[PDB]
Write a protein that binds this DNA or RNA. Sequence first.
RNA 1: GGCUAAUCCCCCAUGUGGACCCGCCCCUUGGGGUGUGUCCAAAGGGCUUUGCCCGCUUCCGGAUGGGCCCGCGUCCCAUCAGCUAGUUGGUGGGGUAAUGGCCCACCAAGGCGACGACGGGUAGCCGGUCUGAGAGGAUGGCCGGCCACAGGGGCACUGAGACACGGGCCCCACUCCUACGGGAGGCAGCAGUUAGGAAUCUUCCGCAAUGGGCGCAAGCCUGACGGAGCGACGCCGCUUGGAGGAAGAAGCCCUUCGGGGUGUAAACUCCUGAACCCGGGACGAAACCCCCGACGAGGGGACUGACGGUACCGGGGUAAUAGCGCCGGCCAACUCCGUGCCAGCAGCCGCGGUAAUACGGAGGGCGCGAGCGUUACCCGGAUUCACUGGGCGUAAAGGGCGUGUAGGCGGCCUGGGGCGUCCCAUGUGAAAGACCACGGCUCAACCGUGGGGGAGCGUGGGAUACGCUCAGGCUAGACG
Lengths: 124, 138, 99, 83, 208, 104
Amino acid sequence: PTINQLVRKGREKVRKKSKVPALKGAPFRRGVCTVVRTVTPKKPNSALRKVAKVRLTSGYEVTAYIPGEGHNLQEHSVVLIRGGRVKDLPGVRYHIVRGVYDAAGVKDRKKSRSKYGTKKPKEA
Amino acid sequence: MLTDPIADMLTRIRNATRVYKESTDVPASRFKEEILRILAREGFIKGYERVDVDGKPYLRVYLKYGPRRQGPDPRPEQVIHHIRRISKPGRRVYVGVKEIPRVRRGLGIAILSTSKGVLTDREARKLGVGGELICEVW
Amino acid sequence: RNLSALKRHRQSLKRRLRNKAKKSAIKTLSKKAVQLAQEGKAEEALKIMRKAESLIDKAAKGSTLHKNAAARRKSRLMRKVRQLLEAAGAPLIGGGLSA
Amino acid sequence: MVKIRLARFGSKHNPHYRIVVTDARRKRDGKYIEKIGYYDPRKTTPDWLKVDVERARYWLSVGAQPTDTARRLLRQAGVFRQE
Amino acid sequence: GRYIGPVCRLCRREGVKLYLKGERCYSPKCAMERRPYPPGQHGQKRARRPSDYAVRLREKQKLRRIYGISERQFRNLFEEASKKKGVTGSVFLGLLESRLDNVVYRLGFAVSRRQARQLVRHGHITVNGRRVDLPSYRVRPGDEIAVAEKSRNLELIRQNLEAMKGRKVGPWLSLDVEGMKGKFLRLPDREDLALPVNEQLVIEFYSR
Amino acid sequence: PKKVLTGVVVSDKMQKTVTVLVERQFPHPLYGKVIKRSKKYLAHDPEEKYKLGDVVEIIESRPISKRKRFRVLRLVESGRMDLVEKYLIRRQNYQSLSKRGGKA
RNA sequence: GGCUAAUCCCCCAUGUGGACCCGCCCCUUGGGGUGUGUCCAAAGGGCUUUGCCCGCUUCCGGAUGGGCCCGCGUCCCAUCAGCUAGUUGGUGGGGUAAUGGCCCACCAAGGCGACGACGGGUAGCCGGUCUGAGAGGAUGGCCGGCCACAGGGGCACUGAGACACGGGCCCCACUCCUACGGGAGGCAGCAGUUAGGAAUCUUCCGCAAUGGGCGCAAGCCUGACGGAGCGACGCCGCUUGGAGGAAGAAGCCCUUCGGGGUGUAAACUCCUGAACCCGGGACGAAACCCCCGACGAGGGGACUGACGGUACCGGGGUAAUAGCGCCGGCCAACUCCGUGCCAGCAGCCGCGGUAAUACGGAGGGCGCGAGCGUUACCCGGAUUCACUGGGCGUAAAGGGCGUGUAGGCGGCCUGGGGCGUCCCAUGUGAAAGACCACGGCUCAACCGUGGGGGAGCGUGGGAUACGCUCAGGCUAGACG
Ligand SMILES: [Zn+2]
């Protein structure tokens, strides 16, 4: 583009689009479980991914992954959503925070406990 | 039409040197002659001289090159490795004496046009003045 | 409740009434005069004008008219009056009028 | 009314005032008209009170009314001593 | 809390001797003696060609573990030595050597840098009279760094200042083994330190 | 200093007032080339002196009306519609480029 | 309805003076002077009471604060292109401290727009802040400057000043009292409650210090402020020990079963000694005031701290918290076991279907450490909106072609101008911050003092190569 053109029209600044309408552009949002289904992976992967429909306080109804070996989520369990998609589950854009509200932490988690919200086991 | 006489000249020069012409003509203009004066003094061109082509005034520009080389491609290194127009019509470029660039860490020059005449970046800095930034050579 | 400085409002009302009363007198006399000059009656037109002039400057004494508010009034008055008096006037009393 | 007073500029437990010429109505730590001195309450250094008496006298020259404490410091730097 | 944990293991990981214990780190036991390979189940296995990162990483870790300092504090010194005029590299080392706790070590009061840290900490140190218990305290040129009178009688201090008889001192220092005093003459220069370090890579590591 | 400006009278259609078209130049803040914008000022002409085509000097004054804070200081050079033309011709293209389109 | 004081209200006088009309002079928008006419002042109180103090009136001037006007700069969408009637100007007038359609009567028919009017959306603005090599991008919380608002809408009164958060009136919604006629309210002040939210504190101490209002003063008021409280929310500082100590315990892990690792780590020995105890105990405070002296300058004297018995000093004194992430590549850190496209991991590429350094545990390791890691968002990497610093034959990208408006751009020579452009001086560019220097708290964080730089704009002076303009000339472009 000519300098005179740049002067006329000028460059247009790029606009990033969110990937997490956890509304309020908040760090976390709490919702209520609706369905504790279990989806199947995509393209190659295969397994029974544990998922959950959630009715957010942000007015949105979303699907969220439930990390961890085993969970305890039910129909009307209160939960906290943290944002983060799952490559295999088309339609799941947030993870559920384990160790908050009704979602119990993972039992027998002796490693990356910070995630999977499990307290420090007392070494006998 | 001939949109930029000055740029036309730097190019004629860039073009001729790339094929190693000895001479090379460019339509004469007081201003263009002023520039060539520096080109010579700074040792970028053997020199130049007024001449008449088809009846009209021109400036012969005597090109200068390094010596012949070894190995394949014996073509001489250019004395004018670079020479780019800066201020141009519809994008004039002027600088204060504090903004006069330092071309090629000092090994190259920059020709300015000041109310004190056409000088090189060093000359300008001395005389403490600024002005349209005609070009850059190195 | 009760911020005993209600007294301020209490007093505002008085002052309001005191001012309001000065001004209406002012306006009344002002016309009164302008209208006399209007009809060409020299003497009484000025006689009244002087009162107007007086009330005005006194209004500016305390904080009723105050400032150039008084000045504006007088000029717009002496002006209107002397001009309307251009009907074979001849400012007799020449009161508020430097002949 | 224009005053000559102190302006808190220290920090917690480390107060440092600025003898200033401001309008009576500003925040104490607000925008002043001119600085004319400073005062270190705790004399933490040998130089705990400068006053530029030249300027002060100018401000007083035109209505500057000093806080009591400000005056007491101005006196120390002999802004009043008329010998 | 600065590290505090097995230390001759760092000596080993850097495959280079680190005097993190003053004494012993001489008596055929710094472990770097007949066991200079890194700690752990893999130490003896062959090492692979380190990545440019690995190299710059290892170099910084060295220079740093030498002064038993936290990355946090270490980094700030560096960013400080980056702004100030002069070859960042050495300027940085200058500041590292100006830590009161280091100086104490440098002046023989303590056998190690850790020990010195404690002597400074537990008050057993002085700086122009006034005592200073801040290990990160920056000693300037022209400061006397004496041992606390009350401690001049301490068994520990008498041993070290004893063996300190004869032992020379850095050309940027000087000490009066009598009154157990010493002075910080000037900021040491890169040449003054025989550090098995290449600040070149340390600067480059903070460049990334 | 009460700001003084120079422009052309592109309009004499009002009473005791004229429309002066002051031109201005400057370097684009980011692309540097010298661009040239322009603004119209309504200046006070009591004597109804200044006529369409006049180049005048405008002077910052005390408000005379709403949207009118300049008085015709003086005349710089009379007659020269070559300028009024540009202005008018430009107004003429407006007479389109909407649902129809501006001539040429 | 009646009584009554005053520094409350009024009339007359004095007129330094000031205001208005008119004339004139100097000035030049309504600035200053002058002459006649007119008009306009005042309050008292206190004593160490014939003097001093507090105060009153008119005018001029300073100082401070403010209103109004103007040049330039100030987001997105043109799937918003035409907008406008008090609308644009005029004359007379109202209102104001003052200009002005601010408002009104009458007159004219204007004003604005693609250099983006009008409309829709978003947003207090700035000093600064974050990021960035920079240009730039993002941002405007704490602190300071300005603006706006005070349950929503409108309005004026009183005042130097308000259209007035803790003043007034009306309408609206809501809450409360009601003998149902009618009343009372407005925490976007401090603290606190409740609701909403992922989420944000003590119904604390004090008026000692700084500042503010009234008072002659004593002093009163001050949720402003100075402090303490809670919260790793951030930054900085500090501890969990230091030295010695086996060719190397046990346990646990691996193994070619020889052995290797955890590891000087431990145990143990000696040294120092955070916490904690005992004693002393602060700066921040010197004025106001009293006394001498003229209620002045100056000298002396007394009172007063929330923090707090905290900081700090001295003595005594115990070895006395460590965690979190990661180890397939990017990326520093590898082995066994379990599992078997499962259970799970996942930022991207991807990993798991019987040998998985990628899942879970363990051992070992790497990083960082009272923190560590995640999520969200901004800048970077992204020269991936490219001014610095990109492109369009085939990768995304030349308009189907022309004619031509606006606009952008313009050969050679001379002269005038000096608008751009360059230089000098000067003014401004507040404080805070940023940078450098020195200094204060044991360091630092933090804070103090000083210095330097600063785009932009105002003013005066100067230069004239280039760009512009004006005048003149030329034929190499163009046209004939
Ligand atoms: Zn060792």
